[PDB]
Amino acid sequence: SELDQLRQEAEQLKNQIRDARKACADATLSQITNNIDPVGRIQMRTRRTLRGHLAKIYAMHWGTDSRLLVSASQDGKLIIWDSYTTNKVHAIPLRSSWVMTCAYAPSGNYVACGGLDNICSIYNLKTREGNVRVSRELAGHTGYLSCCRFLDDNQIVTSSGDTTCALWDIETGQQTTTFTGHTGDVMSLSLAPDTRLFVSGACDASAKLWDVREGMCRQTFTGHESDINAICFFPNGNAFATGSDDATCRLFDLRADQELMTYSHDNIICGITSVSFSKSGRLLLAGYDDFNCNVWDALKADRAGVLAGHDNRVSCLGVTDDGMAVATGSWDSFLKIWN
Amino acid sequence: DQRNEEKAQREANKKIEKQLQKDKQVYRATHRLLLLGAGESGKNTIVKQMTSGIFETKFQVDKVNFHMFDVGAQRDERRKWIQCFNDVTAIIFVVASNRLQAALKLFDSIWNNKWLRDTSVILFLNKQDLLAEKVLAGKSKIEDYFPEFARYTTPEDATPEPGEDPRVTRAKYFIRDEFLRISTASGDGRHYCYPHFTCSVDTENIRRVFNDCRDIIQRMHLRQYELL
């Protein structure tokens, strides 16, 4: 007979959280940034187009040197391109034809891929004996893999589709910490610049901030009206942006516990498939389901421009560490570099 | 120097491109099929003829390689991973015969999904013997769970069932018409449905899939030439 008491306590705690959020809010971001010069119209052209994939590209990850990038497509191939010369350095034929994500190690020695097999495969690239094979096959997830990120050469964080995120440990094959609390499939995750926290956007229209060292959720951010398909930490590390299926992008804050700004246009209704930030954190390049990416001014919520060069919907995009170029991958098996 | 590195990179790229072409020559010669359906629909019996998340079943007929994927091992929620199966030649659907209403709503959601509009579905009305026994015993009824069987009339256009009683044919074609009404209620001529009455021990199912894939590819080729 404690169900009513538990529900009442939960409602009271939610009301207290709402009151605390209201108290800490005094002026919106729109009324505090209306004194700066607008960026103006911006335009970037496709400097390079990378061809060779046979199926739709679902993920891509730039290297830490802004020279090499990996791309995963549904034809069971992992191609490691050379951005400068449009050369295919490697081509790894995966044993699974339904890879949904890919990752590049910060040191560049290993790569990762996961999909509809609940297994994260680590491929060793630094070995040079005529063979490039899978080193470790991480198994233990129940739902499909959605996004994997490397913390170190021996640690990788994976976000499965069974409402659970896990911190793995290569060279052993077993997990270290399991993150629980989501009620929907986790679609994306992004590591903090200092590699201590990471957010995860799930299909419950909520994002949770996790502590890697401990393994408990710190804050939960709400406000989106549909499933969150992408997420990306702000370069400062104290904020992040969420791309949901309600055709709105929202920028949350890690210190105010509430949303800051929304990026919506009445003339477009399409879910956001990928979200990334520039080097300075001023532009929000978010891809859409209407076959092009839109560049958003984070400070003013005004569209700076649109990158329309893809035949099909963009499923992945990422700006390099140095901010020189942004690469977007669509479902037409074409990888393009924009500068 | 830059010259040696460039030459080595060009050689490696040429070798990798040759490998990519070789793999493309065999990737386009295989058709991918997604085997989907509600639980206890008898699809596991077809699978076993030949835990993870995707089961691969490689079978061939008339020199043509087919790649059928079973999605067992995933969670119930499927609005996200179903978008990956948009390049499949067909989506095999198995329906057990309110267990039928759930399958009807699932097929409806599949039909008008914006990313599944191009793909066509093959419909397998499994467990015909169970339906015949249920409708002959009289313990349960379908009129109470579907207030359309009372006014429903048998379609005189097609009823090639020699040994079947009128009632079992009425039930079978009523289920088929219920699926077809949803299929053709909002179609745009881009995808079609292929109902099939199959039992749990039918060895023709692979031939049915082969013929339906042939028809799908023929219609796609006709569309690309703007004839249809």
Partner: nanobody, 128 residues
Amino acid sequence: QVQLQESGGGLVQPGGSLRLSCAASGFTFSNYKMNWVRQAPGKGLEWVSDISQSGASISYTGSVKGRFTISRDNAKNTLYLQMNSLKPEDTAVYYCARCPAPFTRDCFDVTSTTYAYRGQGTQVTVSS
């Protein structure tokens, strides 16, 4: 945050009339589809009825077809299911299901065991 709060439901005689109003909040009402789901004891979740956006297409399941009458009040952020002539087989916990994506008719995963946007629900039972 999406919070669908229901109303109504109590011990009534068979053949009676009930009303279940769902108080939608946290999202734009006239952008999503809505469904009705019930969970009979000892049985799985089942789909009762659905109403398209702006009340264009109304459809019911076979059991309740021709009996209930849904209504979407977009301005007041509420959705009804006017029960009438109840039967001892309609005793189940009813929930309002928000449809996963806006401006889309595919509307997947409504009757899943764990659905994030589904409302809390109220217990509806009939007996004497």
